[PDB]
Design a protein around this ligand. Structure first.
Ligand SMILES: [Zn+2]
Lengths: 108, 292, 204, 166, 144
């Protein structure tokens, strides 16, 4: 549907420059102490979260190799151990995952 | 007249600044390494006795300037606008630090100094008002206290609700003015001359001069008003968001002069409070606070 | 085609305290065994090259080349300096305006050491007070003072193509003695960045 | 094609005299070819006009439009050269003086339709122009008070001049 | 009380079944925020079925249908159920993650089983009591 005459640039300029059509500023921006990067007040930091996922992938890779087959999910609890930490009696009766890396500072 | 004292007080403050500026020849480069938790290890080459922690914050980002209220130079609290003196390790202190007790004291002292400024100019020049000292009370006490000695003419006068509101208006105007806290370390001899008329201020200058091996004393100036400080103060008066003159308690030994301890509460913009919370805090801040 | 060779054939070693300093002139005679045979080689092609009189001719080239910087006389500066020297003088002056002046030389210029199909490089010792002030694109002053004299002692190497009949002495390189003090610092302040690391990585 | 925005960045002012105030720095940066509509980019440009360097970066980081990501890269590049070449001492001490987008050369193609129709396919490109001035953003406008408006009206009545009389 | 998901009611449960099976296997899954919230209730109720007892015949039918991989069925009754015996609820932790930068800008969240062996998530921390405002509140508390 076309108007019976061409729409003037002046008319068009007013429509696009109306405040309703302009981009709004956001004041909910926050700083992440953990990563030192920006975050939203309702959103978690991704720089630190990225570390968790990367460690999770590495941990998951170790578990997959240890299982050695599909549909081999243990019926017993699982635990992760890093270099410098040795399985204890409390770790008995739990699947033990060994990580070549030392215990991460953030991970406890 | 009080205006004359402020004029001469302002001049000596200005001349001291010139002498310190003249004392330092040329610009000397000092390597300051950032030991702050965020962006650690950055080393800034800075001009000695010229650069301030605010300049370093300007170098990094505006977020640093807005959220930094103080600086930890070699583990020592430093005002954001205090010129740097040597190569050191610098960290920025914020209101949300895990241990803001050092920050709390600086905010506590700065609020007391602002209260003292209000008292001296609140009363008419006809009456005689002399500031005795700013008592140091814990934040847990719930109110910051400033002691002032009034003239005999005011012995029978007690502030009303409107009079207390007038004091807050002066304090609110000072916050609105957003006057930066100027910092000068001055010898007792000059400091004694600056506050010679106020005998009570004279002794406080002597006490600080006595503690340190030298006679250097810490002087802070808000606009024309100047006062001695126990420690570092807030960079600017705009930090406070809520301000209130809760109550005034007259000390019983008022024979030579009527010593009044004024109770007030203030909150920084970084730490806003709910309306009901502020009301309860103001009510809890109207109780006499002793020094223990 | 190259009319100059980068580098110095043999780097002369300056002795500490030479600024305080007959005497040094005799040192060349003592070291003439090392350099006079080289001086003869320049003399063979020219026969008018003398260590005593070269500094005056050398000094003019050094000052004149610096003058071209004020007027950005690139064409003139090409002749004064060798191809190697030209980029060094002007590369860092891009988008900058500089007022450079030469104050009276503190001590007379003297040839210090020379070496040599055949390219002859002559080291000349110059102590001179100069005034330098560099401004930004916007005219803001960023380095030096407009009319303050700074006393600097340096050893300047000029070079000539002996083989070419029209070969002439053109400024090639400068030797900086270790005992010389550091140059004046820039007005603006610099920052040394901290290490950059990936998320999983830790501070070092 | 015209590239005068870059030439504006090549302008060199005469050396300032010692008794002359330090000239505020001006940085002209632009991205000539962007596979984006100028109008959409203009909306982003309009909002960020007059804002500080840090504020603009923070707003862009949480923006969902592709153009905003492009602007942030352009803004980051402008800041880097400003410190590197325009002698900007403080990274935070920068604000967006000007921000606008321009049309870029497009590509012409025919859009086929499944049922024998055709359309005019156009590959849009745009230019983005920003000028950055060292220093904090200028203070915002303050609306006129009732007293200010009233005074002007009285002045206007007094300022009136009689027409076509001796 | 239910989000309109899937090409049909079966698809939602099958999609939930796929989501539930993955979470049990890995114990921490990243998915769109809406899906994570929808499946959080099912995961909590499944843990209750594990608590009901391994011998419970009804639990097996629920576990067998919901968990396509049958190796997880022993795990639920012998790993998940023993783990959560002390807990009375809140077995699943769901947090909002920044939206995917995949040109669709989907709302993202991460749902994990509490007590897992995976590294702790970067959870938000409330302000410390040492803060000036908290210290002032502490004084008011002491007086009262
Ligand atoms: Zn983080």
């Amino acid at each position: 549907a076309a108007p019976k005459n061409r729409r003037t640039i002046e008319v068009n300029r007013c429509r696009r420059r109306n405040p309703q059509k302009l981009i709004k500023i956001k004041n909910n921006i926050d700083i992440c102490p953990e990563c030192g990067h920006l975050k939203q007040k309702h959103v978690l930091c991704g720089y630190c979260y990225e570390k968790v996922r990367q460690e999770t992938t590495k941990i998951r890779q170790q578990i997959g190799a240890q299982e050695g087959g599909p549909f081999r999910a243990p019926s017993v609890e699982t635990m992760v151990l890093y270099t410098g930490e040795k399985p204890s009696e409390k770790d008995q009766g739990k699947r033990i995952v060994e990580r070549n890396i030392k215990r991460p500072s953030w991970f406890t | 007249s009080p205006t004359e004292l402020t004029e001469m007080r302002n001049d000596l403050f200005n001349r001291e600044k010139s002498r310190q500026l003249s004392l330092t020849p040329r610009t000397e480069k000092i390597e300051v390494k950032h030991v702050g938790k965020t962006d650690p290890g950055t080393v800034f080459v800075m001009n000695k006795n010229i650069s301030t922690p605010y300049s370093c914050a300007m170098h990094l980002s505006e977020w640093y300037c807005s959220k930094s209220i103080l600086a930890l130079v070699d583990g020592q609290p430093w005002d954001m606008y205090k010129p740097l003196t040597k190569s050191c390790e610098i960290k920025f202190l914020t209101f949300k630090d895990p241990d803001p007790k050092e920050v709390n004291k600086a905010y506590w002292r700065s609020c007391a100094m602002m209260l003292g400024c209000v008292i001296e100019r609140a009363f008419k020049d006809d009456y005689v008002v002399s500031l005795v000292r700013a008592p140091e009370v814990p934040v847990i006490a719930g109110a910051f206290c400033y002691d002032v000695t009034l003239d005999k003419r005011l012995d029978e006068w007690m502030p009303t609700k409107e009079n207390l509101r007038s004091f807050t208006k002066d304090a609110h105007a000072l916050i609105y003015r957003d006057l930066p806290f100027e910092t000068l370390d001055v010898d007792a001899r000059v400091a004694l001359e600056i506050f010679q008329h106020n005998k009570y201020k004279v002794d406080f200058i002597e006490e600080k001069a006595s503690q340190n091996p030298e006679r250097i004393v810490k002087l802070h100036r808000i606009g024309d008003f100047i006062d001695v400080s126990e420690g570092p103060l807030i960079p600017r008066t705009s930090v406070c968001f809520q301000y209130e003159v809760s109550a005034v308690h007259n000390l019983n030994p008022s024979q030579p002069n009527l010593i009044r301890r004024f109770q007030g509460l203030s909150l920084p913009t970084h730490l806003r409070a709910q309306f009901t919370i502020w009301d309860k805090l103001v009510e809890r801040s109207r109780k006499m606070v002793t020094e223990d | 085609h190259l009319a100059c060779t980068a580098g110095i054939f043999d780097p002369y070693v300056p002795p500490e305290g030479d600024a305080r300093m007959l005497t040094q002139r005799t040192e060349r005679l003592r070291k003439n065994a090392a350099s006079q045979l080289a001086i003869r080689k320049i003399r063979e092609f020219d026969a008018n090259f003398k260590t005593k009189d070269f500094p005056e001719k050398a000094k003019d080239i050094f000052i004149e080349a610096h003058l071209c910087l004020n007027n950005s006389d690139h064409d003139r500066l090409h002749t004064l300096v060798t191809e190697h020297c030209f980029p060094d003088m002007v590369w860092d002056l891009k988008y900058k305006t500089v007022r450079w002046g030469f104050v009276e030389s503190l001590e007379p210029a003297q040839v210090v050491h020379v070496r040599c199909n055949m390219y002859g490089q002559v080291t000349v010792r110059l102590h001179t007070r100069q005034t330098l002030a560099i401004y930004d694109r916007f005219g803001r002053l960023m380095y030096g003072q407009e009319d303050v004299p700074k006393d600097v002692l340096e050893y300047v190497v000029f070079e000539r193509h002996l083989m070419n009949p029209y070969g002439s002495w053109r400024m090639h390189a400068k030797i900086v003695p270790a005992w010389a003090p550091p140059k004046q610092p820039i007005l603006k302040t610099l920052m040394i960045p901290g290490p950059q690391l990936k998320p999983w990585e830790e501070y070092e | 094609i015209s590239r005068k925005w870059e030439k504006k960045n090549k302008i060199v002012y005469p050396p300032q005299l010692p008794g002359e105030p330090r000239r505020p720095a001006e940085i002209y940066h632009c991205r000539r070819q962007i596979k984006y509509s100028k109008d959409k980019m203009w909306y982003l440009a309009k909002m960020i006009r007059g804002m500080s360097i840090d504020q603009a970066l923070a707003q862009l980081e949480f923006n969902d439009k592709k153009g905003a990501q492009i602007i942030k890269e352009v803004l980051l590049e402008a800041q880097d050269m400003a410190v590197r070449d325009h002698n900007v001492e403080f990274r935070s001490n920068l604000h967006i003086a000007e921000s606008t987008s321009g049309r870029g050369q497009c590509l012409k193609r025919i859009r086929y339709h499944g049922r024998g129709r055709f359309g005019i396919m156009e590959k849009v490109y745009c230019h983005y122009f920003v000028k950055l001035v060292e220093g904090p953003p200028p203070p915002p406008e303050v609306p006129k008070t009732a007293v200010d408006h009233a005074k002007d009206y009285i002045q206007q009545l007094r300022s009136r001049t009689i027409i076509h009389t001796l | 009380v239910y989000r309109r998901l899937g090409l049909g009611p079966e698809s939602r449960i099958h999609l939930l079944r796929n989501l539930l099976t993955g979470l049990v296997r890995h114990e921490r899954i990243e998915a769109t925020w809406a899906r994570a919230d929808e499946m959080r209730g099912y995961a909590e109720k499944l843990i209750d079925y594990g608590k009901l007892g391994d011998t419970n015949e009804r639990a097996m039918r629920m576990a067998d249908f919901w968990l396509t991989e049958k190796d997880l069925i022993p795990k639920l009754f012998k790993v998940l159920a023993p783990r959560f015996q002390g807990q009375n609820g809140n077995y699943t932790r769901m947090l909002q993650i920044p939206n995917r930068k995949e040109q669709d800008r989907a709302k993202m969240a991460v749902i994990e089983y509490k007590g897992n062996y995976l590294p702790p998530l970067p959870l938000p921390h409330r302000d410390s009591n040492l803060t000036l405002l908290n210290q002032l509140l502490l004084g008011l508390q002491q007086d009262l």
